[PDB]
Design a protein around this ligand. Structure first.
Ligand SMILES: Nc1ncnc2c1ncn2[C@@H]1O[C@H](COP(=O)(O)OP(=O)(O)NP(=O)(O)O)[C@@H](O)[C@H]1O
Ligand SMILES: Nc1ncnc2c1ncn2[C@@H]1O[C@H](COP(=O)(O)OP(=O)(O)NP(=O)(O)O)[C@@H](O)[C@H]1O
Ligand SMILES: [Mg+2]
Ligand SMILES: [Mg+2]
Lengths: 318, 313
């Protein structure tokens, strides 16, 4: 077996990674000292969840984005331990922490804004990204932009992809997604959940098929090949060019559905890399999402259970 | 030559401070203004010594990427260090400042194994010719034998290097029970009585009885700090009361560590009893006037030093 030298590889982007600290406490005593023994500290970020699931699936993958300081080094180390390749751009600022306190049935979180990217670093990353284009065949982009970047930064990145014929799978929300949709350079896939789809449309959430069809058909979403709307336990609703799919999925035992969309995005990206057909793509995406929801870990799948779930999924033209 | 202080922080931390308007439970709290510092009582002592212009070298255990954050912060302050690296990772600690409250999460931190413990002792010995005083602050990290400070102080005594010690509880108890004695201890009043399992009593007669117990045998200086009320001390057979003025206070945390920096400076320079006590309290006071922890403005030193009264009692 030779190490490959071509472009058969997925690039993931995590522009605002975090060192996530999880504090499980018997009780959170306010205005007091809380002593902890079993802290978990992890490499955090939506794009990193996508990366980890791709690595589990066995797809060739490279992680990039911005890292800074010792916390950036911590992230690199976590990826090294997992044998995941990375080529982050180094910044003068410091990678952020995020805190989760798990106490008394509650999850209390403190989320840091993170570093500011300066103009030289913003420009340097674009050049770094350009050079990576000849070695990759798909780009997955997850999460919002860190402070200091122009509003158009994802639009600029997608332009670089479009210029080299590289498909972009995009998973962002709110104004971040809105700015992309209005720009001429298009992602190949977007993956909102139904909540993200409607708040983007500034209209109320409607679970009906007819309303969904109209929603994804609006001129906001023109030029986008795949619109895959994930529906948690109800599966997915999707639009490919001019075709509508409804993706029905079996009921399973859920532990933590967080990162299931990231797991879906990994499935979509794996399927795009391999030029899979519509049914196989939608089934892989949902199988990975479901498998993650069955796990206590975030962005994690047990593939021993893959085939069992995959074969239960119904995809139909609606 | 060896005109230099060594500080020990066996248990450092990367301290994160989050000021929030409200701490919203079971919800997301967004912060933009975060302060992350190289934490530990011994590092407070170190910063204040550096500020006063004393030659100082910081040691202790560090590990992993958080260990390097600590080294880098000292480098930026131009503070010298000679830590010993461990397999484990230096810990974080969290303080959340919300609605007049201070909610803290303190990580237990890394376990120091047998190899590293023994390795550190050798490294420590190698530093005894380079220094003329040692300041030891804080509790032991996980995994160290209860006698570890006893072992350290033994090496100092072997080379006639005086030790200023600031720890509490069973840690201080263990040192006091061993033959190798520190030259100074600096409990606050609360710590003194907690150690003795006695009720807190601020009277001169009670303090004189407390510090003269057999447990404190063979300690040259027992300096009991009293916050805004100043200090009470025993030097050999002499008792001292240190009275101080009422000043504008912002944050007194780390004022004991500032006092310890003052004491150690005074010991290094062989200052007299009055000058040692006045310097110790001046630095404690200067710290209390600052929002930052373990920070002093020396432009205000003389004015406060000049107001301190030291009485033999
Ligand atoms: N409770 C559940 N039961 C079964 N399958 C689920 C469940 N939740 C999610 N899934 C699967 O995972 C897919 C994506 O989940 P979903 O919760 O819609 O993503 P998301 O909200 O974007 N989560 P995140 O990755 O944290 O952003 C779904 O379409 C399902 O196939
Ligand atoms: N509110 C205050 N006003 C004036 N001076 C103070 C005040 N608090 C502390 N000081 C000075 O600082 C010295 C030591 O403070 P103290 O609070 O006794 O230390 P501590 O309890 O060991 N604090 P820490 O360093 O955080 O452990 C006192 O003896 C005073 O000289
Ligand atoms: Mg999502
Ligand atoms: Mg103290």
């Amino acid at each position: 077996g030779l190490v490959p030298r071509g472009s058969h590889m997925i690039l993931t982007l995590t522009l605002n990674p975090s060192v996530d600290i999880s504090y499980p406490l018997t009780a959170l005593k306010l205005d007091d000292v809380n002593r902890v023994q079993e802290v978990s500290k992890t490499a955090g970020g939506k794009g990193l969840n996508v990366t980890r699931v791709l690595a589990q699936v066995g797809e060739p993958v490279l992680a990039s984005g911005f890292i800074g300081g010792e916390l950036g080094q911590f992230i690199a180390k976590k990826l090294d331990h997992a044998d995941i390749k990375h080529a982050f751009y180094n910044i003068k600022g410091e990678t952020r922490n995020c805190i989760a306190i798990l106490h008394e049935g509650q999850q209390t979180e403190i989320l840091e804004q993170g570093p500011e990217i300066d103009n030289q670093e913003a420009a340097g990353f674009i050049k770094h990204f350009e050079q990576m284009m000849e070695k990759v065949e798909a780009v997955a982009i997850s999460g919002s932009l860190p402070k200091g970047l122009n509003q158009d930064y994802y639009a600029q990145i997608i332009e670089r992809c479009q210029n080299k014929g590289v498909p972009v799978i995009l998973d962002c929300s709110g104004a971040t997604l809105q700015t992309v949709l209005e720009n001429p350079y298009k992602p190949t896939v977007i993956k909102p959940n139904i909540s993200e789809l409607y708040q983007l449309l500034n209209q109320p959430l409607d679970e009906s098929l007819e309303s969904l069809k109209q929603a994804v058909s609006q001129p906001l979403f023109e030029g986008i090949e795949w619109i895959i709307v994930s529906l948690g336990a109800q599966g997915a609703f999707a639009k490919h060019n001019h075709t509508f799919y409804r993706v029905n999925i079996p009921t399973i035992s859920v532990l933590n559905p967080v990162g299931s969309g990231d797991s879906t995005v990994a499935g979509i990206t794996s399927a795009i890399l391999n030029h899979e057909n519509d049914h196989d793509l939608l089934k892989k995406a949902n199988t990975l999402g479901m498998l993650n929801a069955q796990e206590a870990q975030t962005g994690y799948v047990n593939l021993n259970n893959y085939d069992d779930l995959f074969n239960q999924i119904e995809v139909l033209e609606v």
